Write a protein that binds this ligand. Sequence first.
Ligand SMILES: *[C@@H]1O[C@H](CO)[C@@H](O[C@@H]2O[C@H](CO)[C@@H](O[C@@H]3O[C@H](CO)[C@@H](O)[C@H](O)[C@@H]3O)[C@H](O)[C@H]2NC(C)=O)[C@H](O)[C@H]1NC(C)=O
Lengths: 48, 180
Amino acid sequence: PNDAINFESNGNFIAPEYAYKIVKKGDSTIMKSELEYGNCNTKCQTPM
Amino acid sequence: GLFGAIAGFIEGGWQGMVDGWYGYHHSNEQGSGYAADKESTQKAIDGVTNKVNSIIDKMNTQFEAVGREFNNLERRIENLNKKMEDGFLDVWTYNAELLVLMENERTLDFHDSNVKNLYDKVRLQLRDNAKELGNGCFEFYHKCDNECMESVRNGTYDYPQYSEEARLKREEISGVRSLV
Ligand SMILES: *[C@@H]1O[C@H](CO)[C@@H](O[C@@H]2O[C@H](CO)[C@@H](O[C@@H]3O[C@H](CO)[C@@H](O)[C@H](O)[C@@H]3O)[C@H](O)[C@H]2NC(C)=O)[C@H](O)[C@H]1NC(C)=O
């Protein structure tokens, strides 16, 4: 917050349109399974 | 086992006893039949139950687990990450496996006293009012009806009450009377 970020380039530049606000911060992981959703609810999840 | 009751002098269990883990069978002119010592089967269960609940309560602060990801040229810090988790899961497996194996041995040798010590209570109450027969079992010198069995069973037998009944018998199966 309250920080500026100043770009400058004379070529070869792929610029942002959109950035990303960190709203909710907490717990999660990037789980590495290959199953798709099954509409259930748990309190324990594992990739299998 | 250790205490020498279960699979010891008391050779094998009775299938006829269903109400509980330990008990008494009897025989007398009216009766004959089993009856579990619930109050001490009950005390035993309070134990074994606490034991399970103690182990669950030790296994909520294991080493925790959440996930992490590695570059192709960081391969050897990937390794270190792996040796680590695979170190910790080698260690909590051993602790689980061994705890169960040990607490299993103790639980089995716990039941083996529960039964010995029950046998010793009956014994200490009945003294020379009854003949310890040695296969887990006592036979009385004085006849002792269903109302007297409970008294032994609920642990308030009364030695002086049957003393002269009993010792008339002891006195005569000593054949000391055979001298007249
Ligand atoms: C981006 O925008 C933020 C928000 O407006 C700017 O932060 C604000 O900058 C002003 C000064 O320009 C801060 O005021 C200062 O306060 C101190 C002490 O109270 C005073 O002694 C100084 O004379 C000055 O006026 C203000 O607090 C600050 N806002 C907050 C709450 O952070 C900022 O200038 C911009 N980003 C930058 C610095 O590139």
